[PDB]
DNA sequence: AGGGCTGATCGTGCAAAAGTCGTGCCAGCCGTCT
DNA sequence: AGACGGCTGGCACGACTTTTGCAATCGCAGCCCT
């Protein structure tokens, strides 16, 4: 649904969704590095709130 | 491309145009029935190529090539008249003033 | 594609009687969605595409 | 549609958080204990007769 | 004394300030692109409808009336495959053959084709499906009465005549076509109002496209310019992470995590300066821009890479990589960086400095000149030599090259 | 208590090759024209 | 009707620009073994 002929704003169409795609993918560069407890453990939770 | 306002709209009829100035501000103080153009405005599209049939047709015609699309502005569907007054807003940076 | 049948077979409908509701689980998660997502942007601005 | 991987579990929020505590119901899981447990914020004991 | 090279005045060099460059020169879309694909490894480096209404497209216009119209299995076959491969400027993008060809029916032949296009040919609008466009403005005409006069004329030019018009060869055309004079100018222009490119006609609506990254506004005089905020990427430095190793009991690994902050936030801090360095390099050119722009691209100095490099500390090769792909919006509107230069002349402005809109205001004139043929590069040195800047033949044939006016013989039309 | 000692530091702009343009200017041409 | 011409562009050569593409030493001292 774009506004102002330049941006769409999918506005929680995506941007939830969209939020949730770019932790995912943050994740899945992190992680995979054996992740600092702290750091992993925030971000999961984040992720669950999401 | 900037879109112009000079009523030139491709593949149009005159007496569309015809109400339509030098401008597309249509000369002040018309009857407005239907719903044809006031504001005569074309969008600037992508050039063509050597395109042969786009050649032969710029051959044939010429000073089109397409180049625009009929971009106009027209009186509201249902809704018709005649004007009282008018307004226009050039931001600084253009100097057209066509019938300005 | 015979063309005639192609384009008729956009168009028919069922039966479909009794309408169930029951729970799900990710393999058919992974069944239905013809695919799996993986990045958060939409759209180009610069060529606006998929 | 798509999909996404989704390493991160996902339980229903929906689940056990209405007046039916599905997961308290199954898991026996207290509604304190297995709430202060999502959050990552408990580390309870899962099994272990030793 | 006995002059010459002597010995007097090394290291290893990396990519870090290099792939910045890399990121300055490539343009921001793409760069916050990198920007993300970079900061995601980084821990530490910070309705659904609305209106929801469909539309025909044309083609889709041209199948709703097809529907309607009586049409067999492989008639509409066809008559989707013709509707499939369709230009926007309503003229058959690939030829019969490629038509029957793709149809993939030895039953399908080129004649049946032909027939059905026809019978398509003309439904909305006239010249539907042009397939190389000429039959199409031939239609068109058919389709208005006879009762206009000169569209005997009209016709046999435009039956085998095209050449002649294509070049504004007037005489030849009248000596070839035995057309009349001053009249086959009549037959010309009813041919001249013929909708070419009609299926164009539906395409008329765009939304907006063209991001402002730095905003000068005029502000009383000497523009106040400024960047926009938001397009400004920046990170944040992970605070937790950040109390999350020295305390960590591998005082060692969450230490190296405080280091490799601490070396980003470097990074970051650079590209904060590049910005700045940008910037102040823009509050220079906005100082050239509060005249050039003010007085317009006509009235512009030509300037150079080192000319603005001089007014900086930045390196040649820095703001040569930090200004590619960059654009701005100003009270002129979105104005790009690489567009900011300009090769300077022999002109007797006393100077030397860039044609631009004064080559496009030339153009101008050159067509401004008797409607009946485009004025010459000699019309153009003399209009440079009005305006008292020397200007040549070939830099005239050059500056119009620029800004792509006609050719002198080419542009010539009866008036 | 001495040796080895070894990889632990930490940078970046400009040059060299390339391109690339200004500028015009000769060849063919078209107009037409006497 | 044939040389006139004005143009235009290829042609080439300088004039200016221009990006890319380099790759530790001086110490250190910590470690580790002996």
Redesign the interface.
């Known amino acids: 649904v774009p506004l102002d002929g330049?941006?769409?704003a999918?506005s929680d169409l995506?941007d939830l969704?969209?939020?949730?795609?770019?932790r995912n993918?943050r994740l899945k560069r992190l992680l995979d590095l054996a992740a600092p407890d702290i750091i992993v453990r925030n971000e999961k939770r984040m992720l669950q709130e999401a | 491309g900037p879109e112009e306002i000079t009523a030139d709209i491709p593949n149009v009829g005159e007496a569309a145009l015809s109400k339509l100035d030098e401008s597309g501000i249509v000369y002040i103080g018309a009857e407005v029935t239907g719903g044809d153009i006031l504001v005569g405005k074309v969008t600037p599209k992508g050039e063509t190529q050597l395109t042969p049939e786009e050649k032969l047709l710029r051959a044939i015609f010429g000073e089109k090539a397409s180049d625009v699309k009929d971009s106009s502005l027209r009186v509201p569907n249902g809704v018709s008249g005649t004007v009282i007054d008018v307004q226009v807003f050039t931001r600084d940076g253009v100097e057209k003033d066509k019938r300005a | 594609k015979?063309?005639?049948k192609f384009?008729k077979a956009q168009t028919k409908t069922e039966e479909f009687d009794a309408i169930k509701i029951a729970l799900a689980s990710?393999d058919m998660?992974?069944s239905?969605?013809?695919?799996?997502?993986?990045?958060?942007?939409?759209?180009?601005?610069?060529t606006?595409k998929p | 549609?798509?999909?996404?991987?989704?390493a991160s579990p996902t339980a229903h929020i929906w689940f056990l958080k209405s007046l039916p505590s599905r997961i308290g119901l199954l898991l026996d899981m207290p509604l304190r204990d297995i709430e202060r447990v999502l959050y990552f914020e408990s580390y309870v004991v899962i099994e272990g007769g030793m | 004394m006995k002059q010459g090279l002597q010995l007097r005045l090394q290291l290893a060099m990396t990519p870090q300030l290099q792939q910045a460059i890399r990121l300055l020169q490539l343009?921001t879309?793409?760069l916050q692109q990198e920007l993300q694909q970079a900061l995601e490894s980084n821990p530490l480096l910070e309705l659904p409808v609305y209106q929801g209404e469909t539309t025909q497209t044309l083609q889709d216009y041209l199948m709703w009336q097809v529907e309607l119209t009586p049409f067999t299995?492989?008639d509409?076959?066809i008559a989707?495959?013709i509707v499939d491969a369709v230009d926007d400027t309503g003229y058959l993008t690939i030829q019969i053959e490629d038509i029957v060809d793709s149809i993939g029916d030895d039953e399908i032949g080129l004649e049946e084709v032909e027939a059905v296009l026809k019978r398509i040919q003309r439904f909305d609008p006239v010249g539907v499906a042009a397939k190389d466009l000429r039959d199409c403005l031939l239609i068109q005409l058919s389709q208005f009465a006879k009762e206009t006069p000169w569209l005997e004329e009209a016709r046999l030019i435009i039956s085998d005549h095209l050449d002649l018009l294509a070049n504004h060869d007037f005489r030849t055309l009248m000596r070839v076509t035995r057309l009349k004079e001053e009249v086959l100018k009549e037959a010309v222009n009813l041919i001249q109002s013929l909708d070419p490119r009609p299926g164009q006609s539906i395409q008329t609506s765009e939304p907006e496209?063209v991001?402002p990254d730095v905003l000068v506004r005029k502000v009383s005089g000497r523009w106040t310019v400024e960047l926009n905020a938001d397009s400004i990427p920046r990170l944040k430095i992970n605070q937790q992470y950040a109390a999350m190793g020295n305390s960590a009991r591998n005082d060692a690994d969450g230490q190296f995590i405080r280091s490799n902050l601490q070396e980003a936030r470097w990074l970051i801090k650079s590209l904060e300066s590049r910005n700045d360095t940008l910037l102040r390099v823009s509050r220079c050119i906005v100082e050239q821009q509060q005249a050039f722009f003010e007085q317009g691209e006509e009235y512009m100095k030509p300037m150079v890479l080192a000319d603005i490099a001089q007014a900086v500390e930045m390196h040649e090769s820095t703001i040569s990589r930090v200004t590619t792909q960059k654009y701005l919006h100003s009270p002129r509107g979105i104005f790009e960086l690489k567009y900011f230069f300009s090769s300077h002349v022999n002109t007797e402005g006393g100077g030397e400095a860039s044609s631009t809109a004064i080559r496009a205001l030339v153009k101008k004139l050159i067509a401004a000149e008797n409607p009946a043929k485009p004025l010459s590069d000699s019309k153009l040195t003399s209009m440079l030599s009005e305006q008292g800047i020397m200007v040549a033949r070939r830099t005239v044939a050059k500056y119009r090259e620029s800004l792509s006016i006609p050719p002198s013989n080419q542009r010539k039309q009866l008036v």
């Open positions: 330049g941006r769409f999918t995506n969704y969209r939020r949730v795609i770019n993918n | 015979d063309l005639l384009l990710p998660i992974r239905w969605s013809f695919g799996e997502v993986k990045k958060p942007e939409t759209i180009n601005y610069r606006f | 549609m798509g999909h996404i991987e989704l | 343009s879309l793409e299995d492989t509409r076959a989707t495959s496209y991001i």
